[PDB]
Fold Insulin.
Amino acid sequence: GIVEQCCASVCSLYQLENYCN
Amino acid sequence: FVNQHLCGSHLVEALYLVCGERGFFYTPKA
């Protein structure tokens, strides 16, 4: 989920944009 | 600024800046 991918590991724009409405 | 570890309020701030008028969902448990 977002914490494992972006906090525990290095985030990316591809992954953050998946959480935009 | 997105390509780093982003935790807690820093993650929500990055979502806010990247998603703009779309808004976003922040689901840290799921």
Notes: Chain A touches chain B at residues 1-3, 6-13, 16-17, 19-21 (CB under 8 Å). The CA atoms of residues 6 and 13 of chain A lie 10 Å apart.
